[PDB]
Amino acid sequence: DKVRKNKDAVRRPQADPALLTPRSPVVTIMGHVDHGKTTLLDKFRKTQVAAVETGGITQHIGAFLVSLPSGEKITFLDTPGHAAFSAMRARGAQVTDIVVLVVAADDGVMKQTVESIQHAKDAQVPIILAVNKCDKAEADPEKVKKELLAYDVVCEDYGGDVQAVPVSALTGDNLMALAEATVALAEMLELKADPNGPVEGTVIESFTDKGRGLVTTAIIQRGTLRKGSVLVAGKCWAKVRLMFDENGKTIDEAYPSMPVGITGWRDLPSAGEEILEVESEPRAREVVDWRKYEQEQEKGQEDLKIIEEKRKEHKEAHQKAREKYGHLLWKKRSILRFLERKEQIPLKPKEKRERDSNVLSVIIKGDVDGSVEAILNIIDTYDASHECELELVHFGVGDVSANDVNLAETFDGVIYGFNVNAGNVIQQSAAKKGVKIKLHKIIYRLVEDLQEELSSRLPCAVEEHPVGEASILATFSVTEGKKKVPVAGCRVQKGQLEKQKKFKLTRNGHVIWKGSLTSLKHHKDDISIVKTGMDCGLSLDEDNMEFQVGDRIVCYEEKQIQAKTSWDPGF
Amino acid sequence: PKKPNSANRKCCRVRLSTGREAVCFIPGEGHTLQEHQIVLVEGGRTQDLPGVKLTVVRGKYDCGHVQKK
RNA sequence: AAUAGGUUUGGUCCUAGCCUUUCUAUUAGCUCUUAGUAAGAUUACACAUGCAAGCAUCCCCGUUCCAGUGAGUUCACCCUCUAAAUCACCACGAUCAAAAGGGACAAGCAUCAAGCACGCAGCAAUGCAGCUCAAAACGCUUAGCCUAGCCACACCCCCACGGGAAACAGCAGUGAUUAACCUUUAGCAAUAAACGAAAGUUUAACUAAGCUAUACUAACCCCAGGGUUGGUCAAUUUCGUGCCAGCCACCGCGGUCACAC
RNA sequence: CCCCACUAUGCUUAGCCCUAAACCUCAACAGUUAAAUCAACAAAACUGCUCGCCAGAACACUACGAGCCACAGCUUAAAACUCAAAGGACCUGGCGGUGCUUCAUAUCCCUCUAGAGGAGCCUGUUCUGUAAUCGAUAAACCCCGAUCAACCUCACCACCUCUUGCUCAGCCUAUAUACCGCCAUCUUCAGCAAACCCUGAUGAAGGCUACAAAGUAAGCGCAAGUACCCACGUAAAGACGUUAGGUCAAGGUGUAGCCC
RNA sequence: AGUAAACUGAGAGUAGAGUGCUUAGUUGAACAGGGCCCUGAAGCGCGUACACACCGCCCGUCACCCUCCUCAAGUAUACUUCAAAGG
RNA sequence: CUGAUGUUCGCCGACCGUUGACUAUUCUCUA
Ligand SMILES: Nc1nc2c(ncn2[C@@H]2O[C@H](COP(=O)(O)OP(=O)(O)OP(=O)(O)O)[C@@H](O)[C@H]2O)c(=O)[nH]1
Ligand SMILES: *C(=O)[C@H](CCSC)NC=O
Ligand SMILES: [K+]
Ligand SMILES: [K+]
Ligand SMILES: [K+]
Ligand SMILES: [K+]
Ligand SMILES: [K+]
Ligand SMILES: [K+]
Ligand SMILES: [K+]
Ligand SMILES: [K+]
Ligand SMILES: [K+]
Ligand SMILES: [K+]
Numbered sequence A: 001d002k003v004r005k006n007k008d009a010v011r012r013p014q015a016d017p018a019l020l021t022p023r024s025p026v027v028t029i030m031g032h033v034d035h036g037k038t039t040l041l042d043k044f045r046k047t048q049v050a051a052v053e054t055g056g057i058t059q060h061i062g063a064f065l066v067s068l069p070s071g072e073k074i075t076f077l078d079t080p081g082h083a084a085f086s087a088m089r090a091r092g093a094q095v096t097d098i099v100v101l102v103v104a105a106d107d108g109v110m111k112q113t114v115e116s117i118q119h120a121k122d123a124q125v126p127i128i129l130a131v132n133k134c135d136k137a138e139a140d141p142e143k144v145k146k147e148l149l150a151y152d153v154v155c156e157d158y159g160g161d162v163q164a165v166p167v168s169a170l171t172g173d174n175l176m177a178l179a180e181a182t183v184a185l186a187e188m189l190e191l192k193a194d195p196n197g198p199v200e201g202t203v204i205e206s207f208t209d210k211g212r213g214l215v216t217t218a219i220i221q222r223g224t225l226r227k228g229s230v231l232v233a234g235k236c237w238a239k240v241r242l243m244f245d246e247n248g249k250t251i252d253e254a255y256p257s258m259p260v261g262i263t264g265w266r267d268l269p270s271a272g273e274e275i276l277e278v279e280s281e282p283r284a285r286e287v288v289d290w291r292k293y294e295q296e297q298e299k300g301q302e303d304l305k306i307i308e309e310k311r312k313e314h315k316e317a318h319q320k321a322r323e324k325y326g327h328l329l330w331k332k333r334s335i336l337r338f339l340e341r342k343e344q345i346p347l348k349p350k351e352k353r354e355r356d357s358n359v360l361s362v363i364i365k366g367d368v369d370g371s372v373e374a375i376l377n378i379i380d381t382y383d384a385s386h387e388c389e390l391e392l393v394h395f396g397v398g399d400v401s402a403n404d405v406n407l408a409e410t411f412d413g414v415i416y417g418f419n420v421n422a423g424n425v426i427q428q429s430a431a432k433k434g435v436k437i438k439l440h441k442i443i444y445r446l447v448e449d450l451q452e453e454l455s456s457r458l459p460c461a462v463e464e465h466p467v468g469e470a471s472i473l474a475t476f477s478v479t480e481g482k483k484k485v486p487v488a489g490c491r492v493q494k495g496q497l498e499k500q501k502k503f504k505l506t507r508n509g510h511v512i513w514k515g516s517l518t519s520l521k522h523h524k525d526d527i528s529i530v531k532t533g534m535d536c537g538l539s540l541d542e543d544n545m546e547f548q549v550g551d552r553i554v555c556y557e558e559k560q561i562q563a564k565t566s567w568d569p570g571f
Numbered sequence B: 001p002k003k004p005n006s007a008n009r010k011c012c013r014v015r016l017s018t019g020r021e022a023v024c025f026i027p028g029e030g031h032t033l034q035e036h037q038i039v040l041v042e043g044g045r046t047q048d049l050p051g052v053k054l055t056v057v058r059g060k061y062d063c064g065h066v067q068k069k
Numbered sequence C: 001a002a003u004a005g006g007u008u009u010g011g012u013c014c015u016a017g018c019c020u021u022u023c024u025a026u027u028a029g030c031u032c033u034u035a036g037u038a039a040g041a042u043u044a045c046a047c048a049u050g051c052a053a054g055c056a057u058c059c060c061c062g063u064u065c066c067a068g069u070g071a072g073u074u075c076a077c078c079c080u081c082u083a084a085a086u087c088a089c090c091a092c093g094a095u096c097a098a099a100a101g102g103g104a105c106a107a108g109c110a111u112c113a114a115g116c117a118c119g120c121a122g123c124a125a126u127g128c129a130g131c132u133c134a135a136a137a138c139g140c141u142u143a144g145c146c147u148a149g150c151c152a153c154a155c156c157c158c159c160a161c162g163g164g165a166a167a168c169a170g171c172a173g174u175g176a177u178u179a180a181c182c183u184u185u186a187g188c189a190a191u192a193a194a195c196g197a198a199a200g201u202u203u204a205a206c207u208a209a210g211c212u213a214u215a216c217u218a219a220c221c222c223c224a225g226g227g228u229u230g231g232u233c234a235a236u237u238u239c240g241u242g243c244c245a246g247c248c249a250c251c252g253c254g255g256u257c258a259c260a261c
Numbered sequence D: 001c002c003c004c005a006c007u008a009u010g011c012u013u014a015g016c017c018c019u020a021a022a023c024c025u026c027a028a029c030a031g032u033u034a035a036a037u038c039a040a041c042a043a044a045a046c047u048g049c050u051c052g053c054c055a056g057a058a059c060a061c062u063a064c065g066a067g068c069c070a071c072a073g074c075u076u077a078a079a080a081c082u083c084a085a086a087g088g089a090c091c092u093g094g095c096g097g098u099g100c101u102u103c104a105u106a107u108c109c110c111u112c113u114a115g116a117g118g119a120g121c122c123u124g125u126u127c128u129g130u131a132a133u134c135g136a137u138a139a140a141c142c143c144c145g146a147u148c149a150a151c152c153u154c155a156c157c158a159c160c161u162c163u164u165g166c167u168c169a170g171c172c173u174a175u176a177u178a179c180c181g182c183c184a185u186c187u188u189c190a191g192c193a194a195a196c197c198c199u200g201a202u203g204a205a206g207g208c209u210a211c212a213a214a215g216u217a218a219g220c221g222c223a224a225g226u227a228c229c230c231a232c233g234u235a236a237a238g239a240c241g242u243u244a245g246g247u248c249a250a251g252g253u254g255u256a257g258c259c260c
Numbered sequence E: 001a002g003u004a005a006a007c008u009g010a011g012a013g014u015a016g017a018g019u020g021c022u023u024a025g026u027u028g029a030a031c032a033g034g035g036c037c038c039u040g041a042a043g044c045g046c047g048u049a050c051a052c053a054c055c056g057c058c059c060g061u062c063a064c065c066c067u068c069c070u071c072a073a074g075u076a077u078a079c080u081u082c083a084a085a086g087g
Numbered sequence F: 001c002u003g004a005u006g007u008u009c010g011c012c013g014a015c016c017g018u019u020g021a022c023u024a025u026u027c028u029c030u031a
């Protein structure tokens, strides 16, 4: 039994009824773009962040520990509404206790409102409906309630459990009712978590800070986190160095259902990864070493099937060439092959081959790991590989670095920064190396620019516009310079023919030829443009073309047209 | 390989952290390296491959250990 | 290079390079039980936060030290003369030690062979035309050194009025970067330093701890893994594969009976 | 390369150029023959003293720099990449359009006799052809395995049938490059080899002089004998090795494969 | 040399089958002397970069491929030096 | 006189069998 011992750290078994102590509810504000999710959050946070955003779009998931006037504390996870951030919405629904669905009355149910509802069903979390924008004209709360019925959201008026509170976050009207409804449902849920023992949690965001290092925002689920706690999260472990809140003030303890930024990570955890506390740092490294090994075995088994395929093909080509002759002495086989080796002249292809023009290599750098995963999921929705190929050289979190410039210069790639900066040293180095750093701040802007670079790679789409049409009548053989020149006598019927514009020969609907006239000569005089009804003798540059009495010729003008990428990202 | 050996020895070209592109031998039976991947290279020349002076380290970065049998 | 060994050839002798066996350090793979001790960023790249210089009847004194780093680089040693400082005060001196003067003082390249004012006399005026150099001048490149320790540097412009600009090469920590990666511990109890007449105060110096098989020492009822096994060179059975897949420090092995995969 | 013609050039004068296997590849001066003479070869071995030069091969009588009446030049002269050798002198053998000498005795040439190559047929082979064997295949295959195929022989081809089968099964399946057996070939040869001894400074190696100088040699072959009509001739014999020569299809058999 | 040449018989093996093979006999020659020129052998040398050995080895031109280096038009970038001075 | 050409190869650790089990050479039968 020489198999690695299991040293993983697992979630503690469900807390005993005695241990369970009441805890605060976790709430997520889910909905569609520009339906008021942030504006509603601001009224309860008592702070305005909507105006202080790039484009007024929420592109991050933030957990804020709001304290209600009654004295209760609630954690609000403000999720993004854009289509790109589907993963962020699913992660929010997996750590939440209640989902506050913000369905605007003016617009109603939308594509991302249904997606928000689906995530709640998978997580099995009670939903509280908030009909925002009730003030504006066409704001029908009843229509929203009826439409939600199709998607399995039944309001109380129609006999359902979901609680619908009409609200207007802009004017702060009826917001108290939604706060009361949220508190009521949380008490019905009877949320309780043991506040003692090894800490459990989930990562909400993970990013690199230049001064504080690797930082992960997380929500505690069991136990209490303190300075010096050893934490494992996937393939990364930490010893808690600093615990801070949304405002940066250090917190000494993080009780269950509390948002807490954690520093001290020796590697950057993935967003959504569970956090567990271990006895010591050597134990943490033991747990991480066993998770890395398991990942290497899973990759190894995958690699084995690919290698076995490459090795089976080669062995067939080897058995075939060997069995070409019998099982004779190898001296004879090389001599018999020498007979067919004297007939063999192969050419070795260059070991280093040229990357084709229609190949876009991109380096993706982002401020937070969740932002990078969003861009990487968008790059996985590329379906136009035939026209142009999109290669991902490297992806990471943090500002643009020399390695990103070196990797871009190595593969002639383009660096795309998302809410990240590039210093003068990095920007100057890119100029010398020819790399293009493309810092953005909005995800729809970074995708539009990604599509513009793909379009440039695409081949120029020539546009063929018919210029004229002329039917041949008589074929002449002219002797000029001791050379017999076949001349096609043609009558222009519709349109005109121009010497520059390209031509093509047409036989009873078939396309015989494609090219330009060698000589255009009319009445022994060269005329560049023959009008409709003008007789013109036509000689081609291709002597193999046979001219009949009834052939047709269609002239055309070719104009290259900028080709746009067929790939659409869904927004 | 150079005479008298005959074989198809799996090699790769890699740009080093110093900025010098070099040919590196991949030891073991079967590999899955691809473009854009990260590898650690060590010394030790391939005796029958003229000019091959670098060797990829199996089991580091994206190059994994040889799969048994 | 040694007590040497392998390898040029059809074979011998000679010569010769390469490699082997020895001993360290770093890094990678795989693997790892405990205790004590020692040592511990790849980088003169950029640094969040905290702390690292106070003392004291006001003046002064100290923060010019310790600690750090190795960028630059014959300012480090000896002699002569001689400030500042210690011996309360003069010491009519000793001790310690600058500046100045004299001597000595890394490596590679001579395909760097000439340097271009590099000398001397005179009170001065001024006069003479000399001075260094194949016994290596001048020059380029490389590097901290001669380690009870010393030298140099202290973000850059050798300097630092001025300017660029806003400084961890103090401790802890971090980004980038590299194959290279220690805790955002505690205490001034000991020693050392600063200050005070003193009781004392302060000190990320330092002390006692934290982390890490990099090393050394010791130990453990249970608990061993890594590499190798053709020759050099200690040590292979049964199969599979068939000049393929692969191996090799060197010589070499594998083409259907492989002690070499 | 051979033949003819003719120019630069070789000559003189005046300037240049500054190179040679400019090598007697052996530095100048002094001294020794004493020994521990001495890797080998060459032209014996060394001592004192001094200057010059050298440090794996190749890159390289090259690149760059500098100098020069040199301008497709000369002198000075590296590095990167590459290799595990290059190199010097030998031993033995082979080979030489290699020397001298003596020869060939159906025989190398000039000679002698009858043939083959041309015709038809007979027979073998190669190609082509066929559903339709295999082996031999320069000398040393080709009326060859066969002193022999209409069936049979037979191993081939097509179709059909049998499965512990004539056999305590079977296989003309692969491999003559695993072999025995039996042979071809040099051989129309005379040489192979044990055991010793000696020489070369105890290197691979070598070992004869008859007025003799380091060889002695069992055994094997030649020879001698025997067969046929002699003591002649013809047969027979003919070692060790050479060509992984022929033959797994005489038979046997190692290894691998087949077993409805 | 009873050779070559010509002629005749027999045998092996088959049921039969060869212009083949093995074998007995008959008749029965010519040339045999010069030569070392040609191709070889022996003896004694010479040469050798060959050594599964001349059917050996081997040099250069002319591709693909891989590695490194140099020259180089125009241009750009970076670094170095200045005051170790003068009024 | 002319006489061009011909892709590829050397190392393993051997060396004991013996041989004896029969037990009796001294008849004939007898009860
Ligand atoms: N008239 C009106 N405007 C409203 C109301 N609630 C929100 N808005 C506006 O709607 C716009 C979008 O508001 P946000 O808070 O950014 O909405 P969101 O759903 O969080 O947006 P994403 O994060 O991009 O999904 C802003 O201009 C608000 O002022 C409301 O009740 N009435
Ligand atoms: C040639 O000249 C051309 C032939 C026409 S056939 C109908 N006519 C005018 O140029
Ligand atoms: K918005
Ligand atoms: K080989
Ligand atoms: K040696
Ligand atoms: K004081
Ligand atoms: K230094
Ligand atoms: K400085
Ligand atoms: K103290
Ligand atoms: K070995
Ligand atoms: K000479
Ligand atoms: K010879």
Ligand SMILES: [K+]
Residues within 6 Å of the ligand: none
């Ligand atoms: K004939």
Ligand SMILES: [K+]
Residues within 6 Å of the ligand: none
């Ligand atoms: K045989």
Ligand SMILES: [K+]
Residues within 6 Å of the ligand: D248
């Ligand atoms: K047989």
Ligand SMILES: [K+]
Residues within 6 Å of the ligand: D248
């Ligand atoms: K057999």
Ligand SMILES: [Mg+2]
Residues within 6 Å of the ligand: A037, A038, A039, A056, A057, A058, A080, A081
């Ligand atoms: Mg929002």
Ligand SMILES: [Mg+2]
Residues within 6 Å of the ligand: B043, B044, B045, B055
């Ligand atoms: Mg190696």
Ligand SMILES: [Mg+2]
Residues within 6 Å of the ligand: C008, D087
């Ligand atoms: Mg040699």
Ligand SMILES: [Mg+2]
Residues within 6 Å of the ligand: none
């Ligand atoms: Mg110090």
Ligand SMILES: [Mg+2]
Residues within 6 Å of the ligand: none
């Ligand atoms: Mg340094």
Ligand SMILES: [Mg+2]
Residues within 6 Å of the ligand: none
């Ligand atoms: Mg003084």
Ligand SMILES: [Mg+2]
Residues within 6 Å of the ligand: C099
């Ligand atoms: Mg001084």
Ligand SMILES: [Mg+2]
Residues within 6 Å of the ligand: C111, D064, D065
């Ligand atoms: Mg030079």
Ligand SMILES: [Mg+2]
Residues within 6 Å of the ligand: C143
């Ligand atoms: Mg330095």
Ligand SMILES: [Mg+2]
Residues within 6 Å of the ligand: C155
């Ligand atoms: Mg600094």
Ligand SMILES: [Mg+2]
Residues within 6 Å of the ligand: none
């Ligand atoms: Mg300074």
Ligand SMILES: [Mg+2]
Residues within 6 Å of the ligand: C168
């Ligand atoms: Mg520090």
